[PDB]
Amino acid sequence: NLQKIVDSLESSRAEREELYKWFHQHPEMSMQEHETSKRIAEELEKLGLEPQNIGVTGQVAVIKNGEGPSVAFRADFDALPITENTGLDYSADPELGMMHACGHDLHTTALLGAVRALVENKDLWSGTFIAVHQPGEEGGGGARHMVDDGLAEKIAAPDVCFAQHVFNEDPAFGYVFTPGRFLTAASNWRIHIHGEGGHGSRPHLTKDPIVVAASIITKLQTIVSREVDPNEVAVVTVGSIEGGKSTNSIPYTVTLGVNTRASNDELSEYVQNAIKRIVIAECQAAGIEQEPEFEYLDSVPAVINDEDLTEQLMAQFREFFGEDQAVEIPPLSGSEDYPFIPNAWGVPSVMWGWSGFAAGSDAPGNHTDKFAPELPDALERGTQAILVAAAPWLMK
Amino acid sequence: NLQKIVDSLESSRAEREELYKWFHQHPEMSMQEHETSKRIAEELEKLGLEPQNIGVTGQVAVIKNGEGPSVAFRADFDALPITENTGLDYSADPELGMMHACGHDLHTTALLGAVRALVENKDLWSGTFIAVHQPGEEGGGGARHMVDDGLAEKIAAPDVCFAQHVFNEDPAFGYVFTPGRFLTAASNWRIHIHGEGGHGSRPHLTKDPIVVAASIITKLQTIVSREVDPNEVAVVTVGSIEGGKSTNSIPYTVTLGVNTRASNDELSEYVQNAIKRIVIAECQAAGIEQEPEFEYLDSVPAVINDEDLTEQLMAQFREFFGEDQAVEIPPLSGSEDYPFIPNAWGVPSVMWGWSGFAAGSDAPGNHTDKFAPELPDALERGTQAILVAAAPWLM
Amino acid sequence: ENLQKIVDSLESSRAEREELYKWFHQHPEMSMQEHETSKRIAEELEKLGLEPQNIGVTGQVAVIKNGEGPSVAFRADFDALPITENTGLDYSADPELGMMHACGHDLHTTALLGAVRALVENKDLWSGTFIAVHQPGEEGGGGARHMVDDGLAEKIAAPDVCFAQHVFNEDPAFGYVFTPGRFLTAASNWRIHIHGEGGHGSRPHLTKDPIVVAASIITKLQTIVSREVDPNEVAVVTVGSIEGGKSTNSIPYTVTLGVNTRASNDELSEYVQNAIKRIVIAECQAAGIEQEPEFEYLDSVPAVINDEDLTEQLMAQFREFFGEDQAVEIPPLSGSEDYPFIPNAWGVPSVMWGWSGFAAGSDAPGNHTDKFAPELPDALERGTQAILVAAAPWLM
Amino acid sequence: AQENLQKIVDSLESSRAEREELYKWFHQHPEMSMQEHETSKRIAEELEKLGLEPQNIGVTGQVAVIKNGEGPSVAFRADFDALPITENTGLDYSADPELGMMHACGHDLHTTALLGAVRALVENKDLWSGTFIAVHQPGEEGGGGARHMVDDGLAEKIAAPDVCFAQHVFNEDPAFGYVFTPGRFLTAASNWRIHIHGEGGHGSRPHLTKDPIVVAASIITKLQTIVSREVDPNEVAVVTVGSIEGGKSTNSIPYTVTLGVNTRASNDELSEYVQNAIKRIVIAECQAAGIEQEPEFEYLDSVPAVINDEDLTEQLMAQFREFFGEDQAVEIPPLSGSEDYPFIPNAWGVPSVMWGWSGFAAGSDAPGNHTDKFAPELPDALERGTQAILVAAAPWLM
Ligand SMILES: C[C@@H](CCc1ccccc1)CCP(=O)(O)C[C@@H](CCC(N)=O)C(=O)O
Ligand SMILES: C[C@@H](CCc1ccccc1)CCP(=O)(O)C[C@@H](CCC(N)=O)C(=O)O
Ligand SMILES: C[C@@H](CCc1ccccc1)CCP(=O)(O)C[C@@H](CCC(N)=O)C(=O)O
Ligand SMILES: C[C@@H](CCc1ccccc1)CCP(=O)(O)C[C@@H](CCC(N)=O)C(=O)O
Ligand SMILES: [Zn+2]
Ligand SMILES: [Zn+2]
Ligand SMILES: [Zn+2]
Ligand SMILES: [Zn+2]
Ligand SMILES: [Zn+2]
Ligand SMILES: [Zn+2]
Ligand SMILES: [Zn+2]
Ligand SMILES: [Zn+2]
């Protein structure tokens, strides 16, 4: 019955690939995914479903098929402010300065494909499936937005909840699982350094925030290089910097965009507090009078996969796909806001990874301007995973 | 004669200040000053003159008044990409992100008021006066543009050529002169650091150009702090930096905006070549594969004022304004493209400064978001100075 | 039965063994120049009726034969560190020496000599061969390699198994810690010489100032760990010493950096060291320095890997003898060791474990602080007992 | 220029061999500031050889008064400390490189010039009239040596002269010539040791440490912004970190790093500004690293900018130009170096000039002071230094 529903996907592959390409060409910023959200709703309605608009642009649909267990599956849909440079025939317009550089369009299309399979083959399963389409995953607070907009009150809990993510992974087109800690705790901040501007030839009459900002970025390197146990995992990335316009003037303000990662909450707070200590001291070293501003954007805890359920899924994937197609890996250094969803329902959860590339780990990585999951396999594998994962509950 | 042309200015003071406030509210980028250039030409025509469009947006008007000596005077008109924060009634709209933070609007209105006073009093003077309204002074190459658009061919060389610049100087509302080296040699560059982007959590799969750019900015300080004779004058300013968008991604490119100063041409070249050496080595340190790019914007040699002509003017200004009102100062650390103008004509030249503020050097400096020369005196004193400098040739 | 009796035999010699430890504590010597320490070790072996063989400059090996049966080797190192002792112990090394046993190598040595004394005084209680290996120059001195290169494996018949241990500030208090497989990190140690051009402090423009360059290098080296290494890996770059110049008003010619690296494996170890070279060269080039920097190799070691079956066997043995509480498995440490050159020369399986020397466990001062002072009697007794407990499955 | 002047100068040929041997002796006995035992003892002996009575003032300093008839009084100062620099000249009279000491600033030459001049004066008392005071000063290289002499009662022990001079050898143009600056000649300086106190540990466990080597590196780098950003480009400022020391084993993280720091500034206000900026930076860098212990600032020495008496400088320039030739004595802009010398004439309350002379055929292309190659060339470097003293004194004494 699992094999039958998977085989039924071949009929719709050409339509599903065109839908993926459409999403690829409509990349939108966190919590502003209006065309994307509207299309997801339309696709769900096309299947006779009643998508519930939760968390501004979020969409949740319940596929009812009699008595039985209930499985939820989550897929996010926001893109990134990166100019597409893939040369794909279906590339987003480079003019947009936006790109699905993390595969969220693929996650979305995978989920819509699985929903379609389930809706069109109710003879092959029993129970309930909940499709959860989440906005704003790229530090936008999207999972929290859905939870705060009454997700757990509006939608009855499932028995289990799953999600997945595409990346440049080995084995090519295979699946990767981690029981227990899978990802890292993260935060995202903007840091505003306020100096005193002036003429480029009279620096002694200024407090030069560009020199201070440079000194800060350099000193921040010492958090990971000297302050964190070498056996732990920690990252401080400064992903953006902006200040000044004219070459011959010293500006007033420099803004830094900062991202942190750590193995656990305590160490995540440690890293963030070290950042604040350094930024304050660097301003003091320069004699800057205005306190630097720390603007919080988002934070997430480390994703922890239910141990028993991860093992159950690995056994199921190995059975269906072959032993070497589903492999256990150590935790990734990435992060995710996904668990806010299963935790609001109070249900166990597993998130896994899959490979979108024949070159596996040699392919360009997520958040490069070249990230381009390979059709047809990347889409077929993500779509099939959802069905395979659901089967022990819905076809058993 | 001079006191008579100076006194005639009160009758137009109201209109001249309205004009200044107009330019103040239309700040435009170097070489792109379409509205201010248009209004400069309109104002010249209002007086019956025939302004010639030279160097994209530049405007030169010749005021012919019988045989006699010829005097050119230059005023620049470009503004800066700074958001105005003066609080003035006539402030440029803050959402423009533009401001006359160097007083170029004042220079222009002082020259338009002086042209008007000369046109309305042709019996009180004798010879020729050239008004040169120059675009793109702020590293735009404006003076060179005018020269390369045939300024020396289209306009007959005067006997002398002058210019002034307002700043926050002592004595309040007075004048300052420097014979010989007055300013520094300068250059302006954009430098592009090309790394390899990726995910914020996987820096090992990237070549992070923000960390490299930070390293460069810090290393560049050693040019002035270790490589230049402590007795010399050198400056390396990084006035802008831009790269990345999302906080959780590592970008591909960072652009630095860089400005140099030096007391002389050889030192100016030494500084620029040191910047290149440092940028190249910092990229190599990170294992960056792409060469960094050096994008030349502009350069000027140090301004040198004719020593005899400077002394002559100092004497003239002290006689008319008062002994204490026109003083000699040591060279400033700033720069100017002005001398390409007189040098194309092959004429002796002086540029001086005047104070636009009651607080003098305690007032906000040029290129701050608060730089606002004080009416009426700031415009009054710059307008008068032009006539007073012109006198020994025309009166 | 016989294990307990041999351990119990230690009680009567406790006073003498503590004074011997204090003697070593007060004679800390530099790596490969442990003249007095080596002489005393030989004298202590001779007073037990043994024939110490001088191998590896200052190294001493004694073979204790006691009839037919298996052979066990045990290694203890004996070099100290150039750290001024600051413990306030009544048996402190003279602070004027500027030398201290800040790593407990005196304790390792005394533990081994005590266990040897037990074995020779109780030959009725065991059978087979015990090999005491006293190794110099472990602190980056290449001591293990000196012993091997001076014919250890040709002069001394291979044992069946080879062991070693190290004291540190560990939990549980006075307990033992084990790690099967990778236990430590690959390391290297270098001196790096930066050659500038000196001059008068007031005329920097006539110099190439190697202090400012050295400062630049130390800062830039932080980006190896902070940016160039996988966050999930283990890597360290420590600059442990710096020296250049004498007069405040002069710009010197040379600055020397003492540098130490750690990495989880050989490939990453080589990466880190190559990255150091690339940074040092570029920073000298950034300053316009003409003379090439010099890289002076001191020592390197691969990651210690404990034999997996043997570690399990020892874990089970220690838990049985001391209590389940008192011997625990721990994740790998970030430190390193040259020990394995010894068993790999003989071609025998090996385990190295740790023991706690402190009531406060991990809250006590750590190795290489100027306060590191393992607590008598427990620290010595537990180290001495471990050797006997580990050898017992073979000798008893 | 005079006939008696030329005669006294000519007399130097008779003593040149012994004077050069003496210079070579001093060169081979370089000693640390305020610890110049053998050099002080030899200076005293050389003055005693000439029948003079040297007075030991300021620990190792020596002053001799030569009175010879009625007339004005001229004092001349020469310093005698060396530097902790390993000599690398390859001179046959090099100091032993194992000593780790060298006269890298020419103070041995200054000293021998002064002793040679004193000898010429003592041997030719028929050619002059008045008083000459030889002032041999220790500890000039930030040792507080001029201060030590003043504090040990120089001005109460030795009657004031009418004028007081000093000179310094360097790699200057014209070759073997003289350079003068009326008014401000040098820069205000200070010298400090700065002690950074972290928390040590094992090299592989940096998270249990506060690493002072990383902090010291960040300090040295950040200190560059004082000159590069905080000081008016038209001014003169220097911040040099001349020494750094911390740690011993490569695989440990140490507890302390010491920085040796030197400042220069055109005036007293700016000098204080720079020093206070150093303290702000050091304190903030330690706080950035979360270091609990306060860093320590250990004051060594400071001097104001040397200012030469304007009229006296013009008098000396005219005198040297007459005697040596116009192109041999030139006016130069202020140098960026410093000197403690003026504490001496200021204690006596008398006008003063210090000038410079060139010790090298290659002039400014020769090795600079405080290089390990600094080697003033005999005979000319010594001859020209000795002559200058006699030429300078001549308007008063001849
Ligand atoms: C799950 C992981 C896939 C890519 C990756 C693979 C291996 C190691 C690092 C990252 C990251 C997914 P992401 O969508 O980009 C989540 C974003 C934002 C997470 C957050 N809200 O903090 C991130 O910065 O990590
Ligand atoms: C002349 C000087 C007045 C402001 C000032 C006064 C004292 C010290 C520094 C600057 C600066 C005039 P400016 O319009 O700002 C010239 C601009 C551009 C000059 C150039 N084209 O390189 C500059 O960067 O220096
Ligand atoms: C085994 C470990 C105990 C101390 C420690 C404990 C936990 C984490 C790090 C170090 C260190 C032993 P060590 O004598 O200090 C080895 C030395 C020298 C090793 C070498 N030859 O590279 C080192 O630098 O690591
Ligand atoms: C007078 C000058 C000669 C060398 C020089 C020449 C040109 C430019 C700078 C220095 C330096 C004499 P010095 O003996 O080296 C004085 C020392 C010490 C002065 C002090 N006590 O602060 C210094 O650091 O400046
Ligand atoms: Zn992403
Ligand atoms: Zn994603
Ligand atoms: Zn300007
Ligand atoms: Zn301007
Ligand atoms: Zn150790
Ligand atoms: Zn050890
Ligand atoms: Zn010196
Ligand atoms: Zn000197």
Numbering used by the authors:
A (entry chain C): 4 to 399
B (entry chain D): 4 to 398
C (entry chain B): 3 to 398
D (entry chain A): 1 to 398
From the primary publication:
The availability of the N-AGA in pure form allowed a detailed characterization of this enzyme, and it was possible to resolve the crystal structure of the enzyme bound to the tetrahedral transition-state inhibitor at a resolution of 1.75 Å, which we report here for the first time. Thus, a highly selective transition-state inhibitor could be developed, that binds this enzyme with a Ki in the nanomolar range. This inhibitor contains the substructure of Gln, the non-cleavable phosphinic group, which mimics the tetrahedral transition state of the amide group and a large acyl part for high-affinity binding. Each metal-binding domain contains two zinc atoms and one molecule of the inhibitor bound to the active site. The two zinc atoms are tightly bound by three histidine residues (His-107, His-168 and His-370), and they are linked by a highly conserved Cys-reside (Cys-105) with the sulfur atom serving as a ligand for both zinc atoms. The tetrahedral phosphinic group of the ligand is bound via its two oxygen atoms to the two zinc atoms offering to both of them a fifth coordination partner and mimicking the transition state of the substrate being cleaved. The free carboxylate group of the Gln side chain is bound by a salt bridge to Arg-264 and by a hydrogen bond to Asn-251. On the other side, the hydrophobic part of the inhibitor resides in a large hydrophobic pocket formed by the side chains of Phe-170, Leu-335, Phe-185, Leu-186, His-168, Gly-337 and Met-354, excluding any water molecules. The hydrophobic part of the synthetic inhibitor is larger than the acyl part of most natural substrates, but still has ample space in this pocket explaining the low substrate specificity of the enzyme for the acyl residue, accommodating a wide range of natural and synthetic substrates.
The skin glands secrete specific odourless precursor molecules, and the action of bacterial enzymes then triggers the release of the volatile odourants from these precursors. Precursor cleavage is then performed by an Nα-glutamine aminoacylase (N-AGA). The N-AGA enzyme releasing odouriferous acids has broad substrate specificity for the acyl part of the substrates, and a wide variety of Gln conjugates are secreted by the host and cleaved by this bacterial enzyme.
